[PDB]
Structures are given as C-alpha cells and as structure tokens.
Amino acid sequence: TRTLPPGVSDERFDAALQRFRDVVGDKWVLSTADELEAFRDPYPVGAAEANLPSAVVSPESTEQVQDIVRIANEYGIPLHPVSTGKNNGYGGAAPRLSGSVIVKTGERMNRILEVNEKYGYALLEPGVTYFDLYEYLQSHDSGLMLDCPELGWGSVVGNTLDRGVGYTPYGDHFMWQTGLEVVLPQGEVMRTGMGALPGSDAWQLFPYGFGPFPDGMFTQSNLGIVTKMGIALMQRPPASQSFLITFDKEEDLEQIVDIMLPLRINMAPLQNVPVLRNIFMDAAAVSKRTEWFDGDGPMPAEAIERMKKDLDLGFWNFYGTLYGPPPLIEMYYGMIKEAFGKIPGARFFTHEERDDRGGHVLQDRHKINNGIPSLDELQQLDWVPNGGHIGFVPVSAPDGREAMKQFEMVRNRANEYNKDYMASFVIGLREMYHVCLFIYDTADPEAREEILQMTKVLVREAAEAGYGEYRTHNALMDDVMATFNWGDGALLKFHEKIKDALDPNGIIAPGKSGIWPQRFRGQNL
Amino acid sequence: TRTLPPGVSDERFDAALQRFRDVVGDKWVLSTADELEAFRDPYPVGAAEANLPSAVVSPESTEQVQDIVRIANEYGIPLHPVSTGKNNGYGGAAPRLSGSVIVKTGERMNRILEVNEKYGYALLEPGVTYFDLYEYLQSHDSGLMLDCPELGWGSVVGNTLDRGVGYTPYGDHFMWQTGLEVVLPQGEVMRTGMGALPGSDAWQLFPYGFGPFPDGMFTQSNLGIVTKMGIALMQRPPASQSFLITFDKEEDLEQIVDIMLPLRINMAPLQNVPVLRNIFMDAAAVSKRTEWFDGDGPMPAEAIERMKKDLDLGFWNFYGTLYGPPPLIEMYYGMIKEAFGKIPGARFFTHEERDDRGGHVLQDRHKINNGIPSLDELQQLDWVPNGGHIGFVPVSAPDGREAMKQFEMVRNRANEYNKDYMASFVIGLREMYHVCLFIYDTADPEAREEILQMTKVLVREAAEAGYGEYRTHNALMDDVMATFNWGDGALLKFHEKIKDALDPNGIIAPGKSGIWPQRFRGQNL
Ligand SMILES: Cc1cc2nc3c(=O)[nH]c(=O)nc-3n(C[C@H](O)[C@H](O)[C@H](O)COP(=O)(O)OP(=O)(O)OC[C@H]3O[C@@H](n4cnc5c(N)ncnc54)[C@H](O)[C@@H]3O)c2cc1C
Ligand SMILES: Cc1cc2nc3c(=O)[nH]c(=O)nc-3n(C[C@H](O)[C@H](O)[C@H](O)COP(=O)(O)OP(=O)(O)OC[C@H]3O[C@@H](n4cnc5c(N)ncnc54)[C@H](O)[C@@H]3O)c2cc1C
Ligand SMILES: COc1cc(CCCO)cc(OC)c1O
Ligand SMILES: COc1cc(CCCO)cc(OC)c1O
C-alpha cells in the first residue's frame, strides 16, 4: 500500500505533491517506494513497519521552506524537517509519525554562509556536514577548528538541533550555537538573538539578543524548520596529545569516575571531553563478534579476556586529549598519570605509543578530539551481520557508584535479551552521558523486537532509579517524555500548550520528543 | 488618588487584596501609599509619574505563589514578580505596567536549599542575596566561590532572571543556571531539566533534561514566577592577582579593544571578564562631581585632566583578574603587559601596588572578581545630589572601531542632553556589553525627562547603526523591543503568541521586554 499522511486521501496527497513540485522542482520531490527506501530508518527498531515517510521534499531556499510549510498547512500534511538526516541510532531521517513528508533541508541548502577568522564563528545552512566545514577550514588555512561527533557525515546544524555533542572543549554544540533563522509552523520566518536586529553584525557574537531566550526551544523540537544557524568555533591550539588509559577490571569503573571528577570539573587537566569505553565498544570498532565468540547468547568471560589480551586493551579504556604548549601538555599528562595510576593495573599510552590494531580507537579519538572528522566508528556496525545500533543514553552524576549502578542495571537487561552491551561514558563538567549502544542484526525481526522491548524496559527501569535519557529514538520518544512527569506531567503540558499555539494545524514533526499537537493526541500514533 | 489595576474597581481590588491576605497573612500585603513609596523606582526616569505598584504581596511558599496567581487570574490583577527587587538602573522593583501588584518572592522565600561541595552547585530560593550565599560559603569553609555583579545586595536568582552578569569565569549567570521551578501564569507549577524527572539527583548537574530547552524563556520574561533556581559554582582557584591598566587618551579605546580580543577569545590570558571603565566611572566611585567642576554643562577638558592627575588614572582604565598557580598567573600577566604595553602611555598596577584613593576601584574589582560581594560601587550615586542612574547597555563587537563609534555616538548625545557619560565595557569572549551609566539628580524633573528623551534617542540612533541593547529600563522596554524587528516584527509576534498561550488572562508582568498580552496590546499602557 501507498504510505499516506493521516487522514489525507490519495487525491489530496497527489495534489499536495504537485504543489510541492511547483515550489522546489519535480526533481526534488520523491514519492515512490524505491526512492523512499533510502529514507526509512537504517537501523529499524521493532518487528513491525514504523516511521514510514510519505515523500521527501528538498528545498533550495528559506523562501521555499516557507511555501512548503504553507502548503502543508493547507492540506494538513505533517512535515519532518531534517538537515542531512543521519540521525542513526535515533531514527535516521525517518519521521516519528508515519505518513509525514520529510523536508530534507540539507540536500540543497548546503552553503557555508560565513566563516569569520577574527571572531571565531561560522554561519551555516543545514547541509554543511562536518566534512564540508573541515574541508573549508583546511582550504582557507584557517586557525579555527570544528567540534564533531564520532561520525563526520552528519550536519553541524542538524546535530546541534538534536543537542548532539562532540569531544573538544566546544563539545556542547548547543552551548556554542549562536543565532538561528527558523520558519515557524505556519510559514513565518524569524531570526533569533542579534539577528532580530536589522543590520547587526553580532548575530554570531552574542547569543541572547533581548527578551526571552528562545533558541533552546528549537532543539529536540517540533516548533519550526531551521534554515540558518551560527556556531562559535574554537581556535586551534599549538599542539595536542591524546592518551589512552587501560583499566583491567569491570569493577574499576567506580574508581575511574571518582578519580576523574576532580580532574575534570575545572576543565584541567582534563581539558577535552573524556570518554570511558568498555572492551565491547572498542573491539567492535576493529573486529567482528565472531572473531571472539560465534556461539549463542551473551559472550563468556574467556572470550572477554581474549579481546583484552589480543587488542591489548582493558575492560575500561579512558581516552583523552590535551591541548596547548608542550610544557603544559606534559604537566597535565603527569597529573593524569599520577592520579589514575593509583588504580591497580592501569596502563598509559599516548597517541605516539601504539601502532597496533587495539590502538586504532586511540588514533580515531586523536582525530575527533582535534576536530578532524572521521567515519572509523562505522566499523562498529560490522560487529554482526546487517548491523545497526540504537542509542540508549541515560544521564549520570559523575559518581563512580552511580556509574556502576547504571552499568549493572543495563548489563543485566542486555544479557536477558541477548544483546551485547557497548558502553561509553562521555564526561562533561558535572554530568556524564552513559552511552549504551546495542548493535544487532537489522534483518532479523526477532532481534528488532527484542531491541525495542529491551529498551522500553530500560527506559522504565532507569526512570524508577531516578535516571533519564538526554536524547532518544523515535520508538522511545513517548516513553522517555513520560518519565519526565514531575507535577502530573507539567513539562509536557507546557510544551503541548506552546506547540498548539505556534502550530494550530499540527504540521511540524508531530510526536518529536513525545510532543503531539492537539489533532493527534489520544491516538495510537 | 489610589493606584488601581487597569479596569479593576476599588471594590474588586479590595476583594482581591483580602484574598491575598487570606493566602499570605495580612501583615504580608502592603497597599497604602506610604507603604508603596519604598517600591517605587529609586532612580525614576521621566518627569511624569510612571510604573506605580498598586500593592506588594510577600508569599512564604511556592504553594502560596500558586494561590496568588490563581486569585490574580480570577480578578484580572497584573502581577510583577521580583526576587529582591534591586533592579536599580532598570526600574528597581517597580512594575512596567502601573497598577500591577508586586509579588516579592524574596522577602520570605529566602532559603539556601542546597549547596553541593562535590559537584559545585547551589539550589536557591529567590531571596538569597549574594551576601547571603557568600556568608554561607564562608561559614562552611567551602571550596567554592560565587559570581557576583558589582552590588551584592541583589538576588542570585533575580539577577539571573534578567540575564545579569558578573566578572569571574562564571560571569554568565544564565549559562551556569541549571534547573528551575516556576509557577506558570495560570498557577501550574513546573520544574525544568532533570527536575522534571521525579527522584533525579541531576537537577543541578545537567541543564537540558529532555525535549525543547525552556529555561531561557523564563529570563527577561513574563511567562511565570520562579520559585527555585539552581546554579553551578566554580571551585576557588589556589591564587589570584588583579591588575589595572591605565590609558591616557580617549582615542586609545580603539587600540585597547583590538589588542584585547586575541588575549580574551580563548579565555586566556584574560581569564576573567575584563572591564574597561572611563575616568568618569572611576571618579564617581571615589568622589563627587563638584570636586572637579562646579560650572554649567559638560565637564571641560582641564577638569577631566585634574581627575586623571589626582586619581592617577587614565581616561580608560582596564581591570582584570588572573587565577591559578602562581607561575601561571605570572606568565599570563607578562603576556598582558607585553600586549597592552604597545599603547603609548599605558601604565600597569597589580592589586599589590596601589593603596591610594585612585586605586579604590582596583581593590573593589579584586573582591568582586574573586566572588567577594561589595556595595562600594553605591558611592557612584553620590556623584551628584539625589543621584540615580539608568543603564543604557548596547552590545558591541569586540572591535575597536565599533567601540569608538559607540563611544562617540553616546558622548555626543550625553553632551547634548547635559548628562555625564560613565562608561564600562564589560567584555565577554566574542562580545562586549557597553555599559553607559548616566548618573543624574533624581529630584530634578527636567533632568529625569532629559534622561528619558536622551535614552529614547540613543536606542533609536544605536539601532540605526545596527546596535541593540541586552537589557533595559521599564521606560525603554517598548522602544528596545521595537528595534528587534527583523522580518516585520517576527520575534515579538512569536513572543506574543507564546505569552497569550501560557497567560490567556494576561496576568504576569505585562509589558516586560515589550511583550504585552492581548488585553493590553495597543493601549499605550
Ligand atoms: C556509531 C555511532 C556513533 C555516534 N556518535 C555520536 C556522537 O559522538 N555524538 C552525537 O551527537 N551523535 C552521535 N551519533 C548519532 C548521530 O550519528 C549524530 O548525532 C548525527 O550527527 C545526527 O544526524 P544529523 O547530523 O544528520 O542530523 P539530522 O538527522 O539532520 O537531524 C537530527 C534531528 O534534528 C532535527 N532537525 C534537524 N534539522 C532540522 C531543521 N532544519 N529544522 C528543524 N529540526 C531539524 C530533527 O528532529 C532531526 O531528526 C552516533 C551514531 C552512531 C551510529
Ligand atoms: C551602580 C550599579 C552597578 C550595577 N552593576 C551591575 C553588574 O555588574 N551586573 C548586573 O547584572 N547588574 C548590575 N546592576 C544592576 C542591578 O544592580 C543588578 O542586576 C541586581 O542584582 C538586579 O536586581 P535583583 O538581583 O534584586 O533582581 P530583581 O529586581 O529581584 O529581579 C530582576 C527582574 O527579574 C525578574 N524576576 C526576578 N525575580 C523573579 C521571579 N522570582 N520570577 C519571575 N521573574 C523574576 C523581574 O523581571 C525582575 O524585575 C548595577 C546597578 C547599579 C546601580
Ligand atoms: C554522546 O552522545 C552520543 C555518543 C555516542 C557514541 C559515543 C561512543 O563513545 C552515540 C550517540 O548516539 C548514537 C550519542 O548520542
Ligand atoms: C554588565 O552589566 C551591567 C554592568 C553595570 C555596571 C558595570 C560597571 O563597571 C551596570 C548594569 O546595569 C545597571 C549592567 O547591566
């Protein structure tokens, strides 16, 4: 059957598709099953079909976005705006609401509008990937560096708009986002901050402007379609050194985190975003599961010791990067060695001390942590046939016992559902993103359903323990927002009220972050 | 005559006042003219009466705030929430809309709810002043320090809610704000961030929570009455050093700013928030105008030279503070001396090198920049009889030509309207707050009217040159929001839609930031 927007007939949708073609050109509207396969979730969750797009519209300009939104309002067509649509682990480009039209802004709105060397910023359209911006900075001999997530094929804008993160001192992308332009849900266009002052040169200099500060309301949001976004860019330091600390025992996690916090909270000596990855995460980056265990069910401890011995890695592997003059780097590395060396069996390696396969992750972090984008971690998806992943990322206090509690709770459910537990604590100043990647055979419908049921269990169990997730997959958005229900669901009620005011026809990404416009509430999707 | 809410009769207002007394206690409702005199703007702007409160209500609890908001909805009573109501320069405690009832949350909601040494944060009620928090930290021998504005008698919460700023590395108060509790305009209570997840310990560790990020919409805002707010607290460094650089000429401003930017953008060597204050600003802190000049009109060049000579200060005076191990401080100070020394006439002083009257401001900055609150700057108001100030604060790029353009533009109008121009550039990473404090005799109605007309001209003239203000006085809020009118007033229309959705009866601080609810729009008050 043809995927159609809810309540929209074949005739009405054909008519809307043609109005879209009038705006963007016939080449830039996709609506056949073969064309749309590329836009389904690449890592499907659940046995049954879900998150089916009805079309893809690729606008060239803000003016075209406004016209697309107005047409969607006339026809009642839901729109899922994306930048590059590489939100893999959280749905890809696929809409939360099946039948929605994807607005792929980044296909043609892909210009670097400004890179300012003096004030250190960029003004970007959504199609600028991290690779694109890196190539620009390299080609202009820029003194600036970008901040990228693990995979460079995503969007500087799009990643920020889901509050994604990277690993340099500028790792909080939303923090350094400065100014945006957005098409509101009925087609009006708005600039935030100093961009609201005509002729201001400070759109990318001063984020707040005047009055209530709105930009965060357009992140993890369905309140508009972003068409331009500014971001601050850090100056590249004169030198850097990355390092790996291997820790032998599962149980070391508690002491690692507790030693880490005093070294991190003042952004020195731990200047970048430390990451603490387990052996499964690192092994998946350089090898397939069957090299260590080709049997049924969870991997046995003998197979784990082999992974560690052969890759020369610990169960927990701490990656960091230091920046600045060589003397500062040496002083900070000495402090780090002296602190973590109090853990029995810890071993230290700089990026120049490992040329072996187990050191491939360290080399990859040394790129990433220096704003050099990479795709090396895509090899994690070769762990099993037809590999995909889902991201389960609860927030943790930077406390070793809390980390251990979360590790044990996730590992337990992981084992129960026969999914390997790849873990990476991504460490901020006062919080940790406990990244749980579950890699699975996306062609196997029982594996897909196990992933869905396992993660719904984990969302509930984590919440009963006081833990919430910072970001989540289409399939989990209602469940995750349901956990943030202090005061009889006060937060969601507030969001719904704003959603219905700005989007009275219920057009933009219905269900994003569990926020449904009035016409869709009380339904089973 | 008695001050009444718009459209509310004496009999209705009396009934509402008694309902307020039911909630908070009859002792905690003020409504006579003598009682309300203290809640008038202490630095009145304009000759005519403006911004008159009809009553003051002091709630003891969030539950009482909810009840007050419910009563106000029933009766159509506008409410102006304040914490400590010390917003001097911007209206004091006085409401934008005359006839509003001030809700002074800080009078009785004044508890430090938590200070966490390990993770470095505080959870505060609105009545905690900077002095209160400092005394707590001292009393408990805390390793943490606060970040305060120039005057310590304001509210850690209230200052943040107007996006006020201080001068340590944590000087962006809203940035370090983490979690809040707010009573929405119809009386519902909501927690943001991880506080929306019942049982989370991360309310003050991770600001975003899940879904659209709303906390900024409650700053410079009329979308609620905030009852609790968290804020991160920096660890106190092992050592510090403050310094003053004096520069001889008005025209040095261009070179000072251009030398400063490379030293600031990486947060080192200029680690704190530098301030660049002109001789009028520093002279007012230690002396009266008639010490230097008792004639008519703007101060002549020779009197300006006498201020410089006796106080041993420049026309421009640069104040900074360095932090960290003693060798790091000495290396950074050497970098700062080498850079700024290229300006002919520059002279350098650390806080150890001046014990004269001219050095009083340096010693005060050494307290403020180390989280030690002060009221010394209140002496600026003794510059002339019955002294008050208004804050005209355009944002400037950190560019010397732009700073000079703004200086010359403001000086030109200050001279025209016979107001001394006290200037302080408060310097962020990529932007400066160009603080123009105009000090005037508040008893002189012509001076008050000159201040109003001069600043209205400056708002328009600055906007014509592409500059907007970050914060403003009641009397200028409509004019300032009117300058942020890109896209035919798109930003204000967006704020108005949200305002009417959350506040359908138009109760909370109508006209704050130029944002009026439907029932008042177009009424010219
Ligand atoms: C192995 C692996 C490792 C990963 N590591 C990381 C990591 O380190 N850090 C990280 O952050 N992520 C990580 N991810 C997740 C994902 O790869 C990235 O976050 C990716 O950059 C997001 O996709 P994107 O940039 O194309 O954004 P998009 O998919 O274009 O956008 C993401 C979402 O933002 C919203 N949005 C986007 N554009 C607009 C717009 N114009 N208007 C309105 N709303 C919009 C929509 O809700 C959209 O679904 C990882 C994934 C995998 C599989
Ligand atoms: C000489 C001088 C120097 C100054 N220097 C500085 C400086 O360095 N930095 C600086 O930031 N300011 C400065 N100011 C301005 C002012 O002194 C401070 O900002 C002061 O801290 C603000 O008053 P307050 O803290 O009592 O906040 P309040 O007056 O309580 O609140 C300010 C506003 O925030 C909102 N608000 C407050 N509480 C609530 C609540 N509970 N719910 C909802 N909304 C609320 C209201 O709009 C209120 O009007 C200066 C003023 C002068 C005269
Ligand atoms: C920090 O946020 C994320 C980190 C990773 C991988 C971290 C590997 O060390 C994946 C994500 O989504 C799939 C995230 O959101
Ligand atoms: C940085 O923000 C402000 C600074 C000052 C005075 C700075 C003196 O050096 C006053 C203000 O309001 C009256 C401000 O908002």
Author numbering:
A (entry chain B), B (entry chain A): 2 to 526
Sentences from the paper on this structure:
On these grounds, we identified the same enzyme, EUGO from Rhodococcus jostii RHA1, as a promising candidate biocatalyst for the efficient and selective dehydrogenation of dihydrosinapyl alcohol into sinapyl alcohol. This VAO-type enzyme is easy to produce using Escherichia coli, and its crystal structure has been determined. To achieve this, a variant of eugenol oxidase was engineered for the oxidation of dihydrosinapyl alcohol into sinapyl alcohol with good conversion and chemoselectivity. To understand the effects of the introduced mutations in the EUGO8X and EUGO10X, their crystal structures were solved at 2.3 and 1.6 Å resolution, respectively.
In that campaign, mutations D151E and Q425S were found to be critical for controlling the selectivity and rate of dehydrogenation, respectively. We therefore incorporated these two mutations into EUGO8X, generating a new biocatalyst referred to as EUGO10X. When purified and assayed, the EUGO10X biocatalyst generated sinapyl alcohol from dihydrosinapyl alcohol with only a trace amount of side products and with complete conversion over 24 h. The 10-fold mutant was found to have a melting temperature of 76 °C, only slightly below that of the thermostable EUGO5X template (80 °C). The D151E and Q425S mutations were introduced in the heart of the active site of EUGO8X, resulting in the EUGO10X mutant featuring enhanced chemoselectivity for dehydrogenation. The high-quality electron density map of EUGO10X complexed with dihydrosinapyl alcohol clearly defines the binding pose of the substrate in the active site. By superposing the substrate-bound structures of EUGO8X and EUGO10X, a subtle ∼20° rotation of the plane of the aromatic ring and concomitant shift in the position of the propanol side chain of dihydrosinapyl alcohol can be observed. This is permitted by the smaller side chain of Q425S. Improved substrate binding is also allowed by the mutations, via a hydrogen-bonding network of the substrate and the side chains of D151E and R278. Inspection of the crystal structure further reveals that E151 may be better positioned than D151 to promote the deprotonation of the reactive quinone methide intermediate, leading to the formation of the dehydrogenated product. Furthermore, E151 may selectively decrease the accessibility of the side chain of the para-quinone methide intermediate to water, due to the bulkiness of its side chain, causing the drastic reduction of the rate of formation of hydroxylated side-products.
